Amino acid sequence: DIVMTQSPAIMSASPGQKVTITCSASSSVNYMHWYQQKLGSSPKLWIYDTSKLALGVPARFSGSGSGTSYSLTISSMEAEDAASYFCHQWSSYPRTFGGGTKLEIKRADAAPTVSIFPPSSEQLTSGGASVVCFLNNFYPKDINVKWKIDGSERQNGVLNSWTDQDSKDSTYSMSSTLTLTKDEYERHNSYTCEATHKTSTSPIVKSFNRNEC
Amino acid sequence: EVQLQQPGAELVKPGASVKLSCKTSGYTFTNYWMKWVKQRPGQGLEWIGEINPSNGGTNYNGKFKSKASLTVDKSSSTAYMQLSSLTSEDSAVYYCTILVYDAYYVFAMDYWGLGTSVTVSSAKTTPPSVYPLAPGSAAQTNSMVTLGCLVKGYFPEPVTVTWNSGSLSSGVHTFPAVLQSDLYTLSSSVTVPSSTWPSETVTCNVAHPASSTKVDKKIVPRDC
Amino acid sequence: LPPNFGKRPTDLALSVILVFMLFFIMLSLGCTMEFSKIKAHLWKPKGLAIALVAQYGIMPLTAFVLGKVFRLKNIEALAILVCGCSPGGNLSNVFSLAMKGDMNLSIVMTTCSTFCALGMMPLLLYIYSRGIYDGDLKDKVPYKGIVISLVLVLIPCTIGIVLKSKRPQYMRYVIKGGMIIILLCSVAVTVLSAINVGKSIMFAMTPLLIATSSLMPFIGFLLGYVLSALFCLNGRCRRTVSMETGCQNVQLCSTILNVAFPPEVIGPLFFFPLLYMIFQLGEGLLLIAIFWCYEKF
């Protein structure tokens, strides 16, 4: 079976930058085709036979290459191009797809808006406590978080959830959950969420103390 | 108007079997092959097999020959895939596809299905526990206030968290859920004007189709 | 988006014109053989056995080895192999007529080859496609198409023979009329094939496949001639056997490929039968011209 490798795996581009994505096979591929998938939707055929365009595909997309190297080029990328692109061959069975290339939208960097919410009283009555750290509207995607108890680092029970690029401002978000027992939450009073991001060298620290309620 | 209709999600138990269906309408059913594609979250698209509705000829994947089995009922114009011995590595989205392709009049077009999020469960359906989150009073009061309601301990996916019955559409960050101890936890955030929060009630409601549980909870400041 | 199809108008016209061609060519050729000579050639299987052995032991093997040593893809190798195992055609009969051959051997050879194809195509297909095709290929074989091809070959020739034997006078008139209508159907087929090859230029194919499709008919001609010569056959029987071995049927390959695979997997191979027929016709015409030049000198 032919194994295709797609590069780059993840990318970022501006609305107007010329962009090229490459797919290299492990054997001679007679024609290569390209599929586009917008997040929360099924894949759609974009370019077939290495040069043709399916119905509805804008004329900004082109394909080239041969042998074991093919390329998809967008001349003037627009805001409606941030998606996932896959290369696909159906000439040498079995049909195989590429790994996938995520084309995103570039913007100016932004700083996270770190927030802290106290554990709910109902959760404490139940017997647990989930400390929540909410980081919103930061660019780029890369960011690190740290949970500190009374000034002491603790990475146990940290659950991190990302988001995807927003259609409005093309930013990201983050949720950090620290799940502990009620007794564990009673043992300490100061909880600090620290965010390290490219925008600011000094981490953004949000503190909450249950001693003062 | 070619359209292929599929179910939304089918939870099964490990070692059991499932029969996914794809119902077609708007085109001559016995004129194009039907292909089945698998998309695992984290991996890429995989091609399972093809079936010809008018002949029954079937090409399969090398690694999906003993697992999948495509059938056709031309009376209702429906295609079926039977998955058997479903392990944990069989949780993915399954699409049914048809490709219109003419080299005489050179042209191509795709028609996909919305997908069927098959998830092996091995666990009982659980209703959510929507613990509300209220910003602390010590925090500075600002024109824009963030409100959330952590949703914990429920199964299986999907789920919908919406504020004021969908009245709010901007600033609603619905974070993807995360699996721990066979239960997936999700949290949401909404940014609202400072005046609106104590003047107009902002209630987040969570709908679980599988348990059919609809829970509405408002956000109020912590009063002690 | 609405139409989704509409390639019928030219394909059906070409099919009906080719059917009329075959009917009238068989009509015009059935006045050149005698029933007694046909049974004389049938009762002695020397030519029939050699032709069948060549066509079903060397042509599939030649196609398989050419595909293996030419580094061809799965679909291309399958196409060349199905073309290799196909029965003989009626271009063989036409060429034998134009090469001064035993037309009593031609019809019997073609009919026996077609019946042996009905019998043996699943067997050869399975044996030689166990490697390049995961699924089964025995079902895709067009038995009904082969049967109707046999009927369309036999009926006009039989009625022409009985017309010539019983009413010699009507033979010349019907032959002249058939030639007249064939003259126009020829330009029709020529223009349709010109359009088809013009489009095939835009949707080009693998040139290794072109090399293999050029090599196959020449190898078939040479091996048939050598096998007939080594078996101590007649001067014209040798040419008849070689020309029957060289020419193969390509409609069966197209039908099998269309049934077995989706249209997008075939793709450029939609015009493979046309290319194979073009190569067969060119090489046969070259050999006929060479033989006629040698005979005149």
Author numbering:
A (entry chain L): 1 to 213
B (entry chain H): 1 to 224
C (entry chain A): 14 to 310
Any passages from the paper?
NTCP and its paralogue ASBT are part of the small SLC10 family of membrane protein transporters, comprising a bundle of transmembrane helices, that import bile acids and related molecules with fairly broad specificity. Binding of this domain to the bile salt uptake protein NTCP on the hepatocyte surface induces internalization and infection through a mechanism that is poorly understood. Despite the pressing need for therapeutic agents to counter HBV, the structure of NTCP remains unsolved. A sodium gradient across the cell membrane is absolutely required for taurocholic acid (TCA) transport by NTCP.
Altogether, 297 residues of NTCP (residues 14–310) and 437 residues of the Fab (residues 1–213 of the light chain and residues 1–224 of the heavy chain) were modelled. The model consists of nine transmembrane helices (numbered from TM1 to TM9), equivalent to TM2 to TM10 in the paralogous ASBT proteins from Neisseria meningitidis and Yersinia frederiksenii. Although the panel domain of NTCP comprises only three helices (TM1, TM5 and TM6) and superposes poorly overall on the bacterial ASBTs, the core domain closely matches those of the bacterial ASBTs. The model of NTCP presents a highly apolar pocket to the cell surface, lined by Leu27, Leu31 and Leu35 of TM1. There are two clusters of interactions, centred around Glu277 of the receptor or Tyr104 of the Fab heavy chain. The antibody therefore appears to be strictly specific for the outward-open form of NTCP.
